[PDB]
Amino acid sequence: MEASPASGPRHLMDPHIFTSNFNNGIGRHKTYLCYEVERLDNGTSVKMDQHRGFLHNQAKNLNSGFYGRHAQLRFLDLVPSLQLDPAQIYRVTWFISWSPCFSWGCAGEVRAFLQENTHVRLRIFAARIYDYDPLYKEALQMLRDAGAQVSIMTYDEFKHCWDTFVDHQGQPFQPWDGLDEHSQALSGRLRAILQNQGN
DNA sequence: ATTTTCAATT
Ligand SMILES: [Zn+2]
Predict the structure, then answer these.
(1) Where would I find the CMP/dCMP-type deaminase domain in this sequence?
(2) Measured in angstroms, what separates residue A41's CA from nucleotide B1's C1'?
(3) What CA–CA distance (Å, rounded) separates A100 from A72?
């Protein structure tokens, strides 16, 4: 297991794990949540020294054997840690490999946060939409009520994501021929869920 | 455009 270099900083993401996790292929994949924090200044976006970070659904705990719930809930507690103030506007984007998520408290608590902080802008990016049965359709509409901000990832974003999430020299990102077929479906799948809004 | 996928330990 070569894994990422020990002398290297944990801020860099391994290329195999990043590609394998973003590959969305059939086999074994660990759910990962990536988020970014930026400070807006009079309409001017400003980035801090380094607030990039991500969370995984895999943790350790043999003595308690207890596992954390949805990674989205854990990030919710990360909001108060930053101590965001209502006098300023901050842009927070959450990236999740899967979009579907059945739960009566996950989206419920997340929706309550948006209602409590209407000045906070939250963007949700769905790398792939296929994890829960069609029921997730109603769950998506519930979150869309307060999170009316849904966007799909594009191949161009993948190139930048690798450089931003991965910074290796001599190992360029090698895109797989699968975004074109899903890229068009992602737009069709996203509008399909919103099409129910006409009802 | 589609691909009948692992996640709590030893
Ligand atoms: Zn959830």
Answers:
(1) 27-143
(2) 42
(3) 12
For strand B, the positions having any atom within 7 A of a protein Cβ are 1-10
User: Taking a C-beta distance cutoff of 8 angstroms, is the pair A72, A101 a contact?
Assistant: yes
Instruction: Using the mean position of ligand 1's atoms as its centre, give its distance from the Cα of residue A52 in Å.
Output: 21
Strands A53-56 and A90-98: unpaired
Other Cβ atoms closer than 10 A to A79: 16
DSSP letter string, A67-87: ----HHHHHHHHHHHHT--TT
| Residue among A161, A164, A165, A79 nearest A122 (CA) | A79
Instruction: Please report which residue ranges of chain A form alpha helices under DSSP H.
Output: 15-23, 71-82, 106-116, 136-146, 155-165, 179-195
Q: Method used for this model?
A: NMR
Yes or no: say if A85 and A76 are a contact pair by the CB < 8 Å rule.
no
Q: What's the full length of chain A, in residues?
A: 199
A181 CA from B3 C1′ (Å) = 11
Which H or E run includes A122?
Answer: strand A121-128
Spatial contact of A123 and A94, defined as CB atoms under 8 Å apart: yes
